[PDB]
């Protein structure tokens, strides 16, 4: 997967991130929101960690290393920004960029209609 060179964390809404924390744990999920303190909200994020028993297979010396990774499933979590260490992008969004544009124009139309209605209703 290739990510745009000028893509800040505001562009990467709905991409699937790979957040790394201080205790060596990786959180993987769809990005929903972020903040000034850099504390995310992740939709289907699944925590992974390397157990202390599997860890010495990572130490520098078969061809490929195989690390059984203890993963827990949690859903719609908010992380805290103090713990976050770095974020990487794993997967693109579901919808295409064109199709995302179509949805956004549609939603702008529907919202403007609803507030026009709410105004003309409060007048009568």
């Amino acid at each position: 997967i290739q990510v745009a060179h000028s893509s800040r964390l505001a562009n990467l809404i709905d991409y699937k991130l790979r957040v790394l924390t201080q205790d060596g744990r990786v959180y993987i999920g769809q990005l929903m929101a972020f903040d000034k303190h850099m504390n995310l909200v992740l939709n289907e994020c699944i925590e992974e960690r390397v157990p202390k028993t599997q860890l010495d297979k990572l130490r520098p010396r078969g061809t490929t290393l195989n690390i059984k990774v203890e993963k827990r499933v949690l859903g719609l979590t908010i992380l805290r920004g103090e713990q976050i260490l770095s974020t990487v992008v794993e997967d693109k969004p579901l919808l295409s960029k064109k199709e995302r544009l179509v949805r956004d124009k549609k939603e702008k139309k529907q919202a403007q209609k609803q507030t026009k209605l709410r105004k003309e209703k409060e007048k009568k």
Partner: protein, 119 residues
Amino acid sequence: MKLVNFLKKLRNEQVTIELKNGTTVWGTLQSVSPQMNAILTDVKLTLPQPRLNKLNSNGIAMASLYLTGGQQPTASDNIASLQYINIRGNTIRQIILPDSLNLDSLLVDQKQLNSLRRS
């Protein structure tokens, strides 16, 4: 004077960020936030072994490199080559700058010079 405004001027240059884990991030630098949130692109995370046999290394940062998803499975040393890393600012210990850039052009704060001419 804030040196973050110095550091924002770099913006397309191969740096090496040495973080507080011990992990070093080598790569082309895109923007830097006002809290020193570096965004690098073509990065090569690596964790230097300590050249003495019995001394291990950071173990938590070994776990952090494997869990990034970019460690080459055949690789002997802890290196992880990954497009687009984003780094929260409090992690950076020091930033190894390139050899070539001239400091005496870059370190001129335009705003300090601005007020000092104005007053």
